[PDB]
Amino acid sequence: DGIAELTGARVEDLAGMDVFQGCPAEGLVSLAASVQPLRAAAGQVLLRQGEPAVSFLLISSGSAEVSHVGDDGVAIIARALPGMIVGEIALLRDSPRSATVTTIEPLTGWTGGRGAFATMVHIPGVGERLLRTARQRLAAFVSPIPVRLADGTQLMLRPVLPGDRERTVHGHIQFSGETLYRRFMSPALMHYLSEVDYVDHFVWVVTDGSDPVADARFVRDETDPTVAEIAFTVADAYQGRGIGSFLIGALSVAARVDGVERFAARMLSDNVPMRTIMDRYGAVWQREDVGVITTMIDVPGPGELSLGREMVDQINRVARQVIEAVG
Numbered sequence: 001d002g003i004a005e006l007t008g009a010r011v012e013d014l015a016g017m018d019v020f021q022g023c024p025a026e027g028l029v030s031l032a033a034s035v036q037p038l039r040a041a042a043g044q045v046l047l048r049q050g051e052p053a054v055s056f057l058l059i060s061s062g063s064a065e066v067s068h069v070g071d072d073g074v075a076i077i078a079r080a081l082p083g084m085i086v087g088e089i090a091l092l093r094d095s096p097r098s099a100t101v102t103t104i105e106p107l108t109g110w111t112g113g114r115g116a117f118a119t120m121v122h123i124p125g126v127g128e129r130l131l132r133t134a135r136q137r138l139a140a141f142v143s144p145i146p147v148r149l150a151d152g153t154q155l156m157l158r159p160v161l162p163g164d165r166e167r168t169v170h171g172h173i174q175f176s177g178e179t180l181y182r183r184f185m186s187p188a189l190m191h192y193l194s195e196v197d198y199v200d201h202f203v204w205v206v207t208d209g210s211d212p213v214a215d216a217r218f219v220r221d222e223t224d225p226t227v228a229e230i231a232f233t234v235a236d237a238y239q240g241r242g243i244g245s246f247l248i249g250a251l252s253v254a255a256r257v258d259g260v261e262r263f264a265a266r267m268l269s270d271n272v273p274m275r276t277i278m279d280r281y282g283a284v285w286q287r288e289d290v291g292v293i294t295t296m297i298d299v300p301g302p303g304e305l306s307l308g309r310e311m312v313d314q315i316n317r318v319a320r321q322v323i324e325a326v327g
């Protein structure tokens, strides 16, 4: 009859989504209180590149184009699908929206702020599922680059994907999810952000027959954003084939996209292959205690790397895809 009703999200609608099915009821009651219903026609702009990222979208039905336009006018375009989160990385990093999001067909879902996202990823089972969805979001448009070493070895170069162990297994640089991302804030949230972040921690992985044989990464300095520390690891049997030499090149291409101007490196003074790699870039060595040496080099500009132009363009394409387009 004349009874009062809720105006917000309904648990019944949220619970219909596969990601929440079976979750504790109280978790959904809290979430329902935190998000708002969204219904969009086709061809409608939901989010605009460069704007404040005040919300994320969770898509219940329909799909959208996600288009990042570079200052060079080059458009880098992904697709957001039902069950997918959109806009959440810029939301969590409090940075301008990375891409314009336009529906390709009628769309429905929910919107929410940073607190709603936190509430959502705290629900048991949900954070892990959403990370799998974030993985799928990347893997849908980012493909590995086949490369061949001078000895003929056939490998693939790809960014780490969300959930991959190479994200969290690094022994060379002192840093973690909580230390790197604390400035932006909750374990579940920090984990999620660390797994989906290509801006402050960028990791390349090299595989042989789908098995990782090497990785390299840079970690952005908290005090000077134009500087990152670098690290490399190549499986023993694969060493001395030029992979490390290749990776510092790949890492430089990604750093340029990420606005990293300079790399810091530390190692033992006797690590000959690693010193040699840095020597090629004009390293000036400073001595520290306990057999350690350090250096700082400029990230080589375009044309400066010994990699072919075609190789550089392929790596640049992927780096832009993972940094710029997809969150």
Ligand SMILES: CC(=O)SCCNC(=O)CCNC(=O)[C@H](O)C(C)(C)COP(=O)(O)OP(=O)(O)OC[C@H]1O[C@@H](n2cnc3c(N)ncnc32)[C@H](O)[C@@H]1OP(=O)(O)O
Pocket (backbone or CB within 6 Å): 172, 230, 231, 232, 233, 234, 235, 238, 239, 240, 241, 242, 243, 244, 245, 246, 265, 266, 267, 268, 271, 272, 273, 274, 276, 277, 280
């Ligand atoms: C900043 C840091 O990350 S420090 C930590 C580095 N990681 C480690 O020490 C873990 C174990 N070692 C590794 O993972 C790898 O060997 C790395 C990352 C050090 C080097 O990567 P690799 O793929 O083995 O090296 P790569 O084959 O590119 O060779 C690098 C250079 O060292 C040279 N080199 C390798 N071995 C020798 C040698 N025995 N004598 C002289 N020069 C050598 C290579 O010729 C090459 O020089 P170049 O520019 O003339 O071509």
Ligand SMILES: [Mg+2]
Pocket (backbone or CB within 6 Å): 154, 208, 209
């Ligand atoms: Mg092989």
